[PDB]
Each structure stands twice: as structure tokens, then as C-alpha cells.
Scaffold this active site. Structure first.
Site, PDB file in Angstrom:
ATOM      1  N   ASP A  20      18.113 -24.811  31.743  1.00 39.97           N
ATOM      2  CA  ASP A  20      18.800 -25.719  32.640  1.00 39.97           C
ATOM      3  C   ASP A  20      18.705 -25.184  34.073  1.00 39.97           C
ATOM      4  O   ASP A  20      18.284 -24.043  34.321  1.00 39.97           O
ATOM      5  CB  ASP A  20      20.249 -25.871  32.185  1.00 39.97           C
ATOM      6  N   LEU A  21      19.059 -26.027  35.040  1.00 41.95           N
ATOM      7  CA  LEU A  21      19.028 -25.534  36.409  1.00 41.95           C
ATOM      8  C   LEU A  21      20.430 -25.344  36.975  1.00 41.95           C
ATOM      9  O   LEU A  21      20.949 -24.223  36.989  1.00 41.95           O
ATOM     10  CB  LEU A  21      18.215 -26.463  37.312  1.00 41.95           C
ATOM     11  N   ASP A  22      21.053 -26.431  37.425  1.00 41.60           N
ATOM     12  CA  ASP A  22      22.344 -26.322  38.086  1.00 41.60           C
ATOM     13  C   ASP A  22      23.381 -25.737  37.138  1.00 41.60           C
ATOM     14  O   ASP A  22      23.514 -26.176  35.992  1.00 41.60           O
ATOM     15  CB  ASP A  22      22.785 -27.690  38.600  1.00 41.60           C
ATOM     16  N   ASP A 198      24.687 -25.227  30.580  1.00 47.85           N
ATOM     17  CA  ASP A 198      26.061 -25.042  31.041  1.00 47.85           C
ATOM     18  C   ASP A 198      26.944 -26.282  30.999  1.00 47.85           C
ATOM     19  O   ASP A 198      28.167 -26.130  31.107  1.00 47.85           O
ATOM     20  CB  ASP A 198      26.063 -24.515  32.481  1.00 47.85           C
TER      21      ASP A 198
HETATM   22  O1  LIG Z   1      20.032 -29.169  35.899  1.00 48.70           O
HETATM   23  S1  LIG Z   1      21.386 -29.765  35.604  1.00 48.70           S
HETATM   24  O2  LIG Z   1      22.421 -28.712  35.412  1.00 48.70           O
HETATM   25  O3  LIG Z   1      21.161 -30.542  34.354  1.00 48.70           O
HETATM   26  O4  LIG Z   1      21.871 -30.762  36.825  1.00 48.70           O
HETATM   27  C1  LIG Z   1      22.567 -31.947  36.433  1.00 48.70           C
HETATM   28  C2  LIG Z   1      23.110 -32.472  37.730  1.00 48.70           C
HETATM   29  O5  LIG Z   1      23.076 -31.337  38.675  1.00 48.70           O
HETATM   30  C3  LIG Z   1      23.351 -31.700  40.082  1.00 48.70           C
HETATM   31  O6  LIG Z   1      24.755 -31.860  40.237  1.00 48.70           O
HETATM   32  C4  LIG Z   1      25.405 -30.687  39.884  1.00 48.70           C
HETATM   33  O7  LIG Z   1      25.047 -29.620  40.862  1.00 48.70           O
HETATM   34  C5  LIG Z   1      25.611 -29.862  42.203  1.00 48.70           C
HETATM   35  C6  LIG Z   1      25.313 -28.670  43.090  1.00 48.70           C
HETATM   36  O8  LIG Z   1      25.426 -27.475  42.337  1.00 48.70           O
HETATM   37  C7  LIG Z   1      27.107 -30.114  42.136  1.00 48.70           C
HETATM   38  O9  LIG Z   1      27.630 -30.415  43.462  1.00 48.70           O
HETATM   39  C8  LIG Z   1      27.413 -31.234  41.207  1.00 48.70           C
HETATM   40  O10 LIG Z   1      28.851 -31.434  41.190  1.00 48.70           O
HETATM   41  C9  LIG Z   1      26.905 -30.928  39.845  1.00 48.70           C
HETATM   42  O11 LIG Z   1      27.197 -32.004  38.895  1.00 48.70           O
HETATM   43  C10 LIG Z   1      22.605 -32.947  40.534  1.00 48.70           C
HETATM   44  O12 LIG Z   1      23.112 -33.397  41.798  1.00 48.70           O
HETATM   45  C11 LIG Z   1      22.682 -34.044  39.537  1.00 48.70           C
HETATM   46  O13 LIG Z   1      21.825 -35.155  39.966  1.00 48.70           O
HETATM   47  C12 LIG Z   1      22.213 -33.585  38.214  1.00 48.70           C
HETATM   48  O14 LIG Z   1      22.230 -34.669  37.277  1.00 48.70           O
HETATM   49 MG   LIG Z   2      23.717 -27.526  34.468  1.00 49.44          MG
END
Ligand SMILES: O=S(=O)(O)OC[C@H]1O[C@H](O[C@H]2O[C@H](CO)[C@@H](O)[C@H](O)[C@H]2O)[C@H](O)[C@@H](O)[C@@H]1O
Ligand SMILES: [Mg+2]
Length: 246
Positions: A20-22, A198
Site C-alpha cells: 500500500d502507499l498512503d 493500513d
Molecule cells: O494508497 S492508499 O493508502 O490506498 O490511498 C488511499 C487514499 O489515499 C489518499 O488519501 C489518504 O492520504 C491523504 C494524505 O496522506 C490523507 O489526507 C487522506 O485523508 C487519506 O485518506 C488519496 O488522497 C486517496 O485518493 C486515496 O484513495
Molecule cells: Mg493506506
């Protein structure tokens, strides 16, 4: 029920890696454009992929164009928008297409609610939408009900809750199916899947990986069906450096 993760694979074992990334490889930020995957982490991800025939992919909810920006100068196999976009090891892309009438209609409805509720952000992803509310958490119930109504009126769309976000995606799209598509293709085929995530979108991936005999890792706090757990993004970074340099 998740146990603290203590497996550190040898650099050249028979694993296929999915990240995963974020919230997993990069820390949560108030806005997506402030997110950065440190350069050292990318080199470690690129070095991990090279020692495993290239069987390493980023499985994210972001669009693939944003993932290529975050991973620059590296280009990995990707799954974007929770599986609705995917790019295999050969660079061939697989994209779920919605009717142009549906995307045009649903964005007009959501925009008419999101201009008048301060702090929320409507993110358009071509075949999906994300309703961000991190800067105004009071609007969570209204946004969740709004997306529920959208997904009941347009059956081709499905709900995907996330951290401070309520997303709308094509029905049948999930990270478990994205991982499944990779696992039948070279160089992923024949390896043991490892998936580190996560958020709630990653639970579908955890489920398929568990049933496949792989290793699922939950990052951070929360109930999870993943078998193993890491505490935070820096623990992912530390684990990733431990695989490369024991
Ligand atoms: O790779 S994923 O983990 O799957 O990412 C899934 C989501 O991740 C990002 O949004 C997330 O990260 C932001 C900065 O960190 C937060 O501001 C936000 O509240 C949080 O929901 C993107 O904007 C979304 O389009 C994406 O669908
Ligand atoms: Mg994530």
C-alpha cells in the site's frame, strides 16, 4: 488477533511483495500533494524487487499517475483506484471503464453538495470519486449518507470507506481482486504473496492473501483480519531496510 510481525524475509526468497502507499510507505498528511515516499525507501523497494524477479507492486487507492509521481524515478507494477486501474510487469494497463453519462451525472450531484460544506474535498479519479473530510470531520455522517445514496441510485458504483475519506468506486473493484490478477501473471506467479496495508480497502487484500497461504501485515491501529501487525510507517521503513541489509 494480529501478532507483531517478526518475519524478515531473506533478500532473495520466493516472495511476491505488495505494498500500500498512503499510511504504509508514506506518512499521513493533511493533503495528498504533501505526501512523499523518501528516496531511500524507494531505492530499498527497487532493490527488493530486483532480487525477486520484479515481483513487487504498489496496490493503492490513488490513480496510477499520482503513484508514478510519488515513486519517481522508479516505475513499478501498479494497481490504482483500489483495483480499477492496473499496470502489469510489461507496462500493459487494465482499466475499468464507466459510461460517460454516469461519471458526468455523479460528479454534478456530488459537486452541488461539496461546494456548500466547507473543508470537504471532492477528488475525481476518472472512474471513481473520493470525498475527503480530514479538515472538517463534522461532515462525516453527511458525506457517508451522500455516497450511500449515490451507490443505491447507480448500481455500477460501490462504497469504499477510508481514513477521513468516503470513496465511490466501480462495483467489483477491490484490492483483493487486484492482487489476484497479479498472482496469476509472471513474475508474481509461483511466489508467496506478502501484502502490507493500513486502511479498510486493504482488508479485501488481506483476506485473499490469508487464504492463499501468504503473509498479511496491518500497519497501525485498528481491528484487522491481517495475521501480522506493524506499528507505524517508520516500522515499515525499518522492516524494509532489514530485508535488504540484515
Ligand atoms: O494508497 S492508499 O493508502 O490506498 O490511498 C488511499 C487514499 O489515499 C489518499 O488519501 C489518504 O492520504 C491523504 C494524505 O496522506 C490523507 O489526507 C487522506 O485523508 C487519506 O485518506 C488519496 O488522497 C486517496 O485518493 C486515496 O484513495
Ligand atoms: Mg493506506
Amino acid at each position: 488477533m494480529a501478532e507483531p510481525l517478526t518475519v524478515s524475509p531473506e533478500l532473495t526468497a520466493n516472495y511476491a511483495y505488495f505494498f500500500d502507499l498512503d499510511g504504509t510507505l508514506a506518512e499521513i498528511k493533511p493533503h495528498p500533494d504533501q505526501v512523499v515516499v523518501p528516496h531511500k525507501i524507494l531505492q530499498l523497494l527497487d532493490r527488493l524487487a530486483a532480487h525477486n524477479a520484479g515481483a513487487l507492486a504498489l496496490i493503492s487507492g490513488r490513480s496510477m499517475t499520482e503513484l508514478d509521481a510519488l515513486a519517481k524515478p522508479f516505475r513499478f507494477p501498479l494497481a490504482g483506484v483500489h483495483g480499477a486501474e492496473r499496470r502489469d510487469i510489461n507496462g500493459k494497463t487494465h482499466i475499468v471503464r464507466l459510461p460517460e453519462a454516469v461519471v458526468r451525472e455523479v460528479e454534478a450531484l456530488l459537486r452541488s453538495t461539496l461546494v456548500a460544506l466547507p473543508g470537504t474535498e471532492l477528488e475525481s479519479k476518472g472512474m471513481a470519486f473520493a470525498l475527503h473530510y480530514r479538515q472538517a470531520p463534522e461532515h462525516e455522517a453527511a458525506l457517508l449518507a451522500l455516497a450511500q445514496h449515490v451507490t443505491q441510485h447507480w448500481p455500477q458504483l460501490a462504497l469504499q470507506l477510508g481514513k477521513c475519506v468516503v470513496e465511490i468506486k466501480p462495483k467489483g473493484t477491490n484490492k483483493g481482486e487486484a492482487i489476484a490478477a497479479f498472482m496469476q501473471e509472471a513474475p508474481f506467479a509461483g511466489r508467496i504473496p506478502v501484502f502490507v496495508g493500513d486502511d479498510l480497502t486493504d482488508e479485501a487484500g488481506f483476506g485473499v492473501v490469508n487464504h492463499a497461504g501468504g503473509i498479511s501485515v496491518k500497519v497501525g491501529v485498528g481491528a484487522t483480519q491481517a495475521a501480522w501487525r506493524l506499528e507505524s510507517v517508520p516500522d515499515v521503513w525499518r522492516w524494509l531496510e532489514q530485508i535488504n541489509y540484515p
